[PDB]
């Protein structure tokens, strides 16, 4: 019942894309972490995951109390969204993302 984003160690807050790249360097596919969006706008976040030995940038949109990777937004929290994709591949959004959120980089 604790859906707090601060409570998740895969959430790193105000770190840069370069800091994310440091943490994903030489990591296995399915490695992931979330940081604040570079814009700092509408309470958005940015998911970065490892796929093909490369770092894939995925916006977490936040609008009218909900979250998701594309409209329609159907998740009530960032934690619910990320938890969902621990066990579902992201391939429906893009066939290049046939991967799960397996291995958090933890603060």
């Amino acid at each position: 019942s604790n859906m707090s984003l601060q409570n998740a160690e895969w959430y790193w807050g105000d770190i840069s894309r370069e800091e994310v790249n440091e943490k994903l360097r030489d990591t296995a596919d399915g490695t992931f972490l979330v940081r604040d969006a570079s814009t700092k706008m509408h309470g958005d976040y940015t998911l970065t995951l490892r796929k093909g030995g490369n770092n894939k940038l995925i916006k977490i949109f936040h609008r009218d109390g909900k979250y998701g990777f594309s409209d329609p937004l159907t998740f009530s929290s960032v934690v619910e969204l990320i938890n969902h994709y621990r066990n579902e591949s992201l391939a429906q959004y893009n066939p290049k993302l046939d991967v799960k959120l397996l291995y958090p980089v933890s603060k």
Partner: peptide
């Protein structure tokens, strides 16, 4: 941008 395009 460098972001992934995510199907709606």
């Amino acid at each position: 941008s460098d972001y992934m395009n995510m199907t709606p």
